[PDB]
Ligand binder design. Structure first.
Ligand code: HEM
Ligand code: HEM
Ligand SMILES: *[C@@H]1O[C@H](CO)[C@@H](O[C@@H]2O[C@H](CO)[C@@H](O[C@@H]3O[C@H](CO)[C@@H](O)[C@H](O)[C@H]3NC(C)=O)[C@H](O)[C@H]2NC(C)=O)[C@H](O)[C@H]1NC(C)=O
Ligand SMILES: *[C@@H]1O[C@H](CO)[C@@H](O[C@@H]2O[C@H](CO)[C@@H](O[C@@H]3O[C@H](CO)[C@@H](O)[C@H](O)[C@H]3NC(C)=O)[C@H](O)[C@H]2NC(C)=O)[C@H](O)[C@H]1NC(C)=O
Ligand SMILES: CCCCCCNC(=O)Oc1cccc(-c2ccc([C@H](C)C(=O)O)cc2F)c1
Ligand SMILES: CCCCCCNC(=O)Oc1cccc(-c2ccc([C@H](C)C(=O)O)cc2F)c1
Ligand SMILES: CCCCCCCCO[C@@H]1O[C@H](CO)[C@@H](O)[C@H](O)[C@H]1O
Ligand SMILES: CCCCCCCCO[C@@H]1O[C@H](CO)[C@@H](O)[C@H](O)[C@H]1O
Ligand SMILES: CCCCCCCCO[C@@H]1O[C@H](CO)[C@@H](O)[C@H](O)[C@H]1O
Ligand SMILES: CCCCCCCCO[C@@H]1O[C@H](CO)[C@@H](O)[C@H](O)[C@H]1O
Ligand SMILES: *[C@@H]1O[C@H](CO)[C@@H](O)[C@H](O)[C@H]1NC(C)=O
Ligand SMILES: *[C@@H]1O[C@H](CO)[C@@H](O)[C@H](O)[C@H]1NC(C)=O
Ligand SMILES: *[C@@H]1O[C@H](CO)[C@@H](O)[C@H](O)[C@H]1NC(C)=O
Ligand SMILES: *[C@@H]1O[C@H](CO)[C@@H](O)[C@H](O)[C@H]1NC(C)=O
Lengths: 557, 557
């Protein structure tokens, strides 16, 4: 019924009904005009003929290694390119945020209510004739059929880029501070009201939980030492709520910032490393500032650990998954002469695309054990039996699974994958091709073009009939990968804007925060600017073991 | 003990202790270097020799009327000047925000906890030898003595600029949506978590209160009609909490967005006008959009009323109090090619400086009655007896009191003025002269320079001894006024940055919001861009009475 159901407006123009059977497009600042915003302005058709495709740019960034080696050693050149990456990627994100699961038009409720995930594309209106708007059938294909035909793992497919379990569990640990769905309200809602990198997964979402986790001596978090090594405190000693099944011994009920981190030992490994790092930084600050009290030591260490996190995420984590020869840079100063909003709201679609469960292996291999999912889940005694050193040695050399390319969701978490499809529909997501247009990509014109193969393409065509009705989440996991890559085009071109905006939109990146005194002086500032995944593991894990996000990297002798 | 107690760092450099008896200043991006950040960079001393004083600029803006008449009719010139006003005023405000009453250093707690008012200058540390830091006595002068000697009204002093009760009650109504101190927590805390112009004073701070105030037909707010005219609903009909003394008849217990608006009929007059305006806009939108439901009509009318408010505040309200011949402009488009953060956090000092109780008259005169404070307070039957038309006619011609110039706080609210001094001390405010330096003003070198007279100056010198120990709040009210003006220098030069930043920092001013479709099309957009205090009263008060913020303005025949 809604005349905007067909999504007639292009190029980020906005649709508005103007009667029961009529619409108008608002083409303001789109670069286009005309009824559906498709006639380019003169300056726009020039930029269009000059702009290279994402696959062209990706080819360039992943070849000519010798030229990038030159560029990487010319600081002004490296800065210039990183600046463009930041600004061109951030422009794709609405900031201040706009739509959410209940509001397909801008409203004060959608702007001000922080309990919602925001939305990059508005939901399909309730009174539309079909799920995607006007295209398709009265119903989308059975989600269990989609799952089983093109999503479920047969044989484990490894990641050609070499991503390991250090990478997989870093992904899970990092993202779980800002993907925290509020299930009491629904899939369109979040419990992470900080909407970004605030490290609430280490410190607690609320003040009360934080104070239970703190020692109130020297800025430190509470801890215990077992077999000479430092671990989180227990729930019995702190009274912090954690999710643990009934049979776990009290001594194994570790209490950390995020209540669900007892779920797997891989999460608890990173929780332990960052706990140790917080207390390490406290001791360094206390040496510089014998005059400081506990509160300032705590707050300043937290700011430093936020900086470390963003530094590592950009220069090690995103660096690895990008596959680029260009050396990415964490440098807030790059945006001080640019237009940029230091704020962020977590988008629902960002959460959806980050469901990388194909990363998970068939078994978790530590030392000479091959733990099944049943044995690994909620078993912190595995963590104590082997210790972190052994964990790092094993996870560094265990390959993760490929995310794009299809048929690699492990059957142990199939219910989560089915839920991803279902809840996506529940939240009235627009189609894959609408999302592609939203992020300046060419719509796919067939399923074979989407997957780059024949067999899954044929399954999908039988289930969906029209490529314009294909859904976002299953498309991301069956998409044709880039050459020898873990992801396809749609994953990179949607994820990068959310990512970079999320990272640089943090207040510590703003001019009034980004200065030595914020972090306790040059010593604290330097901890941020020299941080790396290797130095994080080196400083806080016994023996300073070698690590990396890539199984292919040789350990030196 | 804290080596930063003397506030050694100048020019917005930040002080940090580096041991028990040593400090370092961080001069990053200040324009200065050296130990206390006082050696200007080459580009800085040039700008310094060229910059005109605030009193010089104010003279220019309030003379040469004939030249401004020319400038005002050259749109590109008017735009150019208004743009500079916005950017140069906004630069004075830390955004993202920094300090608060508990944090004299940057911290994630001060950034993320929206229950605090933010702070333009950090609090004096707890372990400082004196209240102001190092200067002064062990104690500040008795606040009751300060109050009685230089603050309390003897004879009513009228405002030379002609501000009337329409102006006074607009000030109280408008500001009370973002000055809402949380007394359960303390003077450094707020209940207005929107931190700006969200119109929570009409719609309610929470979703629950909002839904009790809504009709859920046509986007409208609940209402009743008495003697042919529209008034807010009752608490009995809505169950909305309001503050009312025990004896008020249920039929006179009007329920509006802000719970304290039953306090005076002047507040309830504006609450009634804006209630009528919301429902007026609903009917206009429903005519354009017969296909829209109640929720979209409600949300869109709210966005339109936010725009109207900012438009009126800038072009009528601030225009009047400024005294400028230059015609101020509400135009978000002026900032689209500038660096600007679309966000705002309400500062404690902004709240403090806006305590304009000298505005209040000795009696409130409506028709031929002269109501005392005792008779006026909580008496909504005064509102019904006379009606809004009569209220507008009387308040338009009743002069408000002068704010600067001293001795004009009415004795009916002296306890509020004493509390302002006390709570200011409680919140460990730095001195007047520190605040002046913070906003690029020359410190006063004597009390006579501050007041521009001899008698109050001598009282203050006996109470305070040193001008460097003079406090911010009493200084604002005794300060030498500009010629024939309601305020002194410190009030304008502190208030304008908070104001303009607060107004333009609203998300409806951002590029993705500021477009016709956000407001239901060109008809809704036009309601914002042609709004004025006269058209607000004309459209919603019976007979369309003449109004203005100035008693001096002639009504046409
Ligand atoms: C270690 C094994 C893992 C298991 C058993 C697991 C299982 C689950 C389950 C059951 C959920 C849904 C829980 C709920 O109802 O809220 C979930 C959510 C999620 N998982 Fe996994 N997961 C694992 C690892 C990972 C990894 C490696 C990633 C990659 C980033 C990941 C990303 C996510 C995301 C983004 C969510 C959504 C979280 C939210 O919205 O709150 N998980 N996982
Ligand atoms: C109509 C007569 C007025 C009365 C009886 C009055 C009385 C009061 C009182 C008693 C308070 C403190 C209440 C509390 O404990 O929170 C207060 C606060 C305040 N008043 Fe007035 N006032 C009046 C008008 C005005 C006017 C014209 C202004 C000018 C803007 C104004 C500005 C303020 C401000 C800014 C506050 C602080 C509010 C807060 O922090 O929550 N008031 N007023
Ligand atoms: C952000 O948006 C959320 C979604 O609209 C709001 O959550 C809704 O709050 C309603 C009350 O404010 C809840 O309804 C109430 O439920 C209780 C118990 O179930 C009843 O006693 C109430 O009568 C009932 N009222 C109504 C009108 O339904 C909703 O259940 C709840 N919705 C969801 C999906 O959780 C948030 O409150 C809002 N947050 C903020 C900060 O405004
Ligand atoms: C923003 O900052 C506020 C000031 O720090 C926080 O308010 C404080 O919350 C404490 C609990 O989180 C309150 O203390 C508790 O009071 C109750 C009852 O009085 C006791 O049961 C608790 O044991 C006690 N705990 C402690 C550690 O004191 C403080 O009274 C309260 N302070 C003030 C001034 O109100 C806000 O919680 C915080 N808001 C957010 C969103 O984090
Ligand atoms: C709220 C903070 C969120 C930050 C999440 C960081 N991103 C992340 O962890 O995973 C993701 C998820 C999806 C895409 C990306 C990503 C891929 C490529 C690039 C290169 C540099 C490019 O721009 O071309 C940048 C990216 F960011 C990262
Ligand atoms: C959160 C939103 C707050 C907005 C409050 C609006 N300001 C207000 O109502 O009162 C105030 C309070 C104090 C000063 C001013 C003010 C004075 C002069 C000027 C001119 C234009 C100049 O720049 O030179 C601008 C101003 F803003 C307004
Ligand atoms: C080749 C020199 C480095 C260029 C870095 C570009 C990084 C990402 O640039 C991206 O390119 C895409 C396709 O052009 C666009 O769709 C995105 O808007 C743009 O951000
Ligand atoms: C002149 C600058 C170098 C251009 C490099 C060739 C353009 C990129 O070649 C790319 O190859 C990919 C292989 O999977 C294809 O998927 C893309 O469609 C294609 O654009
Ligand atoms: C005279 C032409 C119009 C100029 C408008 C200036 C409006 C306010 O400009 C103010 O001037 C003050 C003194 O120079 C400075 O201290 C403030 O930073 C600046 O914002
Ligand atoms: C050359 C441009 C015109 C300059 C106008 C004269 C400078 C402003 O003259 C001002 O007069 C005020 C009167 O109260 C004084 O308080 C100020 O100190 C003074 O600067
Ligand atoms: C706009 O889109 C509609 C279908 O949604 C189409 O019928 C019409 O031709 C388009 N208008 C123009 C000018 O292309
Ligand atoms: C947990 O791991 C230990 C070995 O560390 C093993 O003995 C035990 O059976 C495991 N528990 C479960 C429930 O798998
Ligand atoms: C810095 O200020 C201190 C007093 O706080 C003063 O003693 C010192 O001389 C100043 N330093 C310089 C270089 O002016
Ligand atoms: C309220 O006003 C009415 C006149 O409108 C008057 O009769 C009454 O006495 C007033 N009440 C108080 C408590 O002053």
């Amino acid at each position: 019924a809604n005349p905007c159901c067909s999504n007639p407006c292009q190029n980020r123009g906005e649709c508005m009904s103007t009667g029961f059977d009529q619409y108008k497009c608002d083409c303001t600042r789109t670069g286009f005009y005309g009824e559906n915003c498709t006639t380019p302005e003169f300056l726009t058709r020039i930029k269009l003929l000059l702009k290279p495709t994402p696959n062209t740019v990706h080819y360039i960034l992943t070849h000519f290694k010798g030229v990038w080696n030159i560029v990487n050693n010319i600081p002004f050149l490296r800065s210039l390119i990183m600046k463009y990456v930041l600004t061109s990627r951030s422009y794709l994100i609405d900031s201040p945020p706009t739509y959410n699961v209940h509001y397909g038009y801008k409203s004060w409720e959608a702007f001000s209510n922080l309990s919602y995930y925001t939305r990059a594309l508005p939901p399909v209106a309730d009174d539309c004739p079909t799920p995607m708007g006007v295209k398709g059938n009265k119903e989308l294909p059975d989600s269990k059929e989609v799952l089983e035909k093109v999503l479920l793992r047969r044989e484990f497919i490894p990641d050609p880029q070499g991503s390991n379990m250090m990478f997989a569990f870093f992904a899970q640990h990092f993202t779980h501070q800002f993907f925290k769905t509020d299930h009491k309200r629904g899939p369109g809602f979040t419990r992470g009201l900080g909407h970004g990198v605030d490290l609430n997964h280490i410190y607690g979402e609320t003040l009360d939980r934080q104070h239970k986790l703190r020692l109130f001596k020297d800025g430190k978090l509470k801890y215990q030492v077992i077999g000479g090594e430092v671990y989180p405190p227990t729930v019995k000693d702190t009274q912090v709520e954690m999710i643990y099944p009934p049979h776990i011994p009290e001594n194994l009920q570790f209490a950390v910032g995020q209540e669900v981190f007892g779920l797997v030992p891989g999460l608890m490994m990173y929780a332990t490393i960052w706990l140790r790092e917080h207390n390490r930084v406290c001791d360094i600050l206390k040496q510089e500032h014998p005059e400081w009290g506990d509160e300032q030591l705590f707050q300043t260490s937290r700011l430093i650990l936020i900086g470390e996190t963003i530094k590592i995420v950009i220069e090690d984590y995103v660096q690895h998954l990008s596959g680029y020869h260009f050396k990415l840079k964490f440098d807030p100063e790059l945006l001080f002469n640019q237009q940029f909003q230091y704020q962020n709201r977590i988008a629902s679609e960002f959460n959806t695309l980050y469901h990388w469960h194909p990363l998970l292996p068939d078994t978790f291999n530590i030392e000479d054990q091959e733990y099944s999912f049943k044995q690994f889940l909620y078993n912190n005694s595995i963590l104590l039996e082997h210790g972190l050193t052994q964990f790092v040695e094993s996870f560094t050399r265990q390959i993760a699974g490929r995310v794009a390319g299809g048929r690699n969701v492990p059957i142990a978490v199939q219910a989560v994958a089915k839920a991803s499809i279902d809840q996506s529909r529940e939240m009235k997501y627009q189609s894959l091709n609408e999302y592609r247009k939203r992020f300046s990509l060419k719509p796919y014109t067939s399923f074979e073009e989407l997957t780059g193969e024949k067999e899954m393409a044929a399954e999908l065509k039988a289930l969906y009939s029209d490529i314009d009705v294909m859904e976002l989440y299953p498309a991301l996991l069956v998409e044709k990968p880039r050459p020898d890559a873990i992801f396809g085009e749609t994953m990179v071109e949607l994820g990068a804007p959310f990512s970079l905006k999320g990272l640089m939109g943090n207040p510590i990146c703003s001019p009034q925060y980004w200065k030595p005194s914020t972090f306790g002086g040059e010593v604290g500032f330097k901890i941020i600017n020299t941080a790396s995944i290797q130095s994080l593991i080196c400083n806080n894990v016994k023996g300073c073991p070698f690590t990396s996000f890539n199984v292919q990297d040789p350990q030196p002798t």
